[PDB]
Assembly symmetry: C6
């Protein structure tokens, strides 16, 4: 990655970072919590480091191929926004990055450093991570095993356990933060068992999740 000692300098990706990423993917596959873990392990990442982390995954090649497809789409839209002059470059001067330069396929580490450490920075690392996360979210959703519609409380299931499944499903199904805030007063109640549902109805509306979990405890 790029970090300050100080000044902004390139640092070797650590065995710890490399191992942490591979292990989280081995253990959790594309459970949605893997995404913010990817983001935090890739703190300060050059595009080279981002390729390194993705390339070190041995499984999930279906997913990695879908991710390439997402990255080419984003790359093509970059090149539509920021077309570069095809003429040869000014001696000693910074060339403008292309989609494939951001994706690290046609850029060197040195060019990647040049861009990221420029005043002001061309943040090719951050632009690329954005594309990658956009792609990883598609895969979380694809790999989401269960519709929120099939998350219903078992007659003998503690409410808290039911709500954990519900909001875990909502997260993988990529429901917006609004519909997460809103499903409380709608589908969470409708999908609750009769006993708890009766209690929840009687709370009336405006009931916090904390109050609902209290009520059906």
């Amino acid at each position: 990655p790029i970090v300050q000692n100080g000044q902004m300098v390139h640092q070797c990706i650590s065995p710890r970072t490399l191992n942490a990423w591979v292990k989280v993917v081995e253990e959790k596959a594309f459970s949605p919590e893997v995404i913010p873990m990817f983001s935090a392990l890739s703190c300060g990442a050059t595009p080279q480091d981002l390729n390194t982390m993705l390339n070190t995954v041995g499984g999930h090649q279906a997913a990695m191929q879908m991710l390439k497809e997402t990255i080419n789409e984003e790359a093509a839209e970059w090149d539509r926004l920021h077309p570069v002059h095809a003429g040869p470059i000014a001696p000693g001067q910074m060339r403008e990055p292309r989609g494939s330069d951001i994706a690290g396929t046609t850029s060197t580490l040195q060019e990647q450093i040049g861009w990221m450490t420029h005043n002001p920075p061309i943040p090719v690392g951050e632009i690329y991570k954005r594309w990658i996360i956009l792609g990883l979210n598609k895969i979380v959703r694809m790999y989401s095993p269960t519709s929120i519609l099939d998350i219903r409380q078992g007659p003998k299931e503690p409410f808290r356990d039911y709500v954990d499944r519900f909001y875990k499903t909502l997260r993988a199904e990529q429901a917006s933060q609004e519909v997460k805030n809103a499903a409380t007063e709608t589908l969470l109640v409708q999908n609750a068992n009769p006993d708890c549902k009766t209690i929840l109805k009687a709370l009336g509306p405006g009931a916090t999740l904390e109050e609902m979990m209290t009520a059906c405890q």
Copy 2:
């Protein structure tokens, strides 16, 4: 986080910190000791780092949704206290943070750095951690399985084991430090078994916990 090398500079959250947090949550869920562990692992945390740690939790989505609700409440009270001018910002100048800027949802890492490293600091990291801990304590209490009233010494249970359950329950039930200091001379004795209770009564009042544990050893 933000640390001194020196001067105050941003540092990538470490794989060790990320792994430690996820593991403590996997092993201990919302046992009350998880809170001061969260606090210490989040030493120097930007709001981004605080979101990162919370977002890396894969389970307990019921709890994480309750936490959002706590954070929106605190955020709304911040905005009631410190309303910001809605006009566009002075070129090159620090804008005032809003509730959602402190929660890291509408603020950039750079703005978060600007605030935290300002002279004097606007400690958005520390303000946010406060909100989060307030929220985590609600969840400790919610997840507390047992009323102090049902912590009674078994006829064959060593007093020390009984007292460990008692003060563990009191801690999860969020009893104040006063009522922790006071329950000694009241409920600890009443909830003790007949044999030990007889010994404890005969100590008279003002008996330290050390003296009571000695007495019923």
Copy 3:
């Protein structure tokens, strides 16, 4: 903790330190070797770091409550020795610490830093660790399962194994270094089995432990 880079600056307590402390307590409870381990893991600790380490212990709440009682006693004796002027403080100036300021309950991290890094230092970290260790030794002794009087050599037990139990018991029972130096020529021999006891008597007095262990090998 506080360390030199250099100059004296505050450093985040490490996940390694946090994990090491919790693990030693999980594995060893209040075996006496846990105390010097606590001392060494808490090298350079602010009172905040000392609270952090104690607060991260999930079990042993009986012990943690006894420790508070020890800390309040020490705190009250501090305040008897070093009463502070109750008037408001000189702008920009260091206030004098109270018992509860040393225990970290009424002091901020910044005040704790101010004191510890002052010329000369007010070593609130070291004063507090002293109180805590005083409290932990009471708990070692309380939790000591066995009187030295019941450490007797089995007829078939190697002398070395008997001496390991004896000096392990003496350590937990908090016997002074004198009585550790002295019990050799008295209780170690009396508690030895007949066979070895006969050999030990015949050594006459002034026999080193090394000579006694040699003699009964």
Copy 4:
């Protein structure tokens, strides 16, 4: 390796790096993901460090012998491109590296440092790693157990599982990124089971992998 503290200086290869490399080879042998792992663990590597990592592998001596053969070929082509003057060297001056100097067999660490830290650098580390990776890819391909032609979807096999095997096989068989982009619309469909194949045909052409995986879910 060589890193900046600062200035460019030699650093001992870490036990962590050494252990990480040996463990990845023990666990994964020559699965293609081992190559980018080798590349990232060898970040900043001198040729000495590259020999060290390869030499620490205890198994796979067939592969290590093939790798030497690749390295001698590359070395011979270097010497064809950059023949060196056989006359004795200018006192105190940098000699030109030969194929075997790049491979670290006839060069000292100091000469390797001289070259890599020269203005401008002679990047013998990077030139050698290139040769090594060229050699490792031959071995990935050799060790590839299965022709893409024998990756066919089982009648009861989830499409996603079939696609994971397909793109895992394509990767080990070293198929170009074009033929990875292209096999989607050809062999992936032909090798799909009848049920899914019928669905895929009906998508018509231009179907993304994401759409195909959706369609046969």
Copy 5:
């Protein structure tokens, strides 16, 4: 310990060092290889750090008591060599260390730092480690289970295995490097089985260990 950043400054003993020492003692007890491990883990150690490492051992209290006895003897001989003036000390000036100051029982960390960082250094750490190792060697020897005289090659035992037991026993029995160099041509042969003994005799004298192991392979 004391290290250079730079200049000579005090550093907290690391959790890694603390854990490494306790684990080596748990796994190996007083096998002779534990001594050079103790020496290397205690690199740069103040007497405080040396007490810390010894104090963190939970078992082997027989051994730890023998070690105190060794340390008091060495301490008493120090005080015989370097008696100190009993008069009060020159304000702001370095006092001379006593036996118990070197053993860390009557010295502060600051005094220990003063001595060790003085120009020239009073190396109380190194003087104390010497005493401790002297004491640990007595314990290795005491704890040595087997006389070299009972190391005899089994009729079916590979010579190499016999020699490993022989030189392992010699090491624990603290045989000098001379008698290690010499026992080759004497007791190693006499303690060898008849078959190998016949071969070894026929080598004649001056046979290296390498030649003897070759001969009886």
Copy 6:
């Protein structure tokens, strides 16, 4: 070891290095890959550090005694090459190292530092490591269980598995890189099974190992 912060300064050998060395010896004994691992773990090692690593090995005392014998031989040849003047040394001046000074038996750490950090360096660490590796290779060869002559392909054994055993045996038997390059066209074929041997003969000469492994796949 000795490293640059910067300037050349002494550093404590790390618990990680100490543990890594002991573990590699516990797991792999004297498999030839242990040697380059020893070399890399001993990067920057003083002779003291080299003694430390060898001394921390608890097993293999037969081997460690053979190693001493190798080191005395090398030491005696050093003293034949570089005899030192037996007169007392120039006050404040660097004495010349003897064989036993290089082996760390008669030299202090400070003298070892003086030599290694001198302008220009007297590289006693590197000279000693050379002696040690020379000695370790003798032991690899001694401990080599199997003649290359007994590495023959089983009728049902994959060629690749046969070649792995062959080149693993060649490595332990310390065959030169020439005879490793050459045995391909000779003994590898002769020791191959009839089926594969027939294929290999028909390749004619000049067949790379890659072509032979392809041919008999």
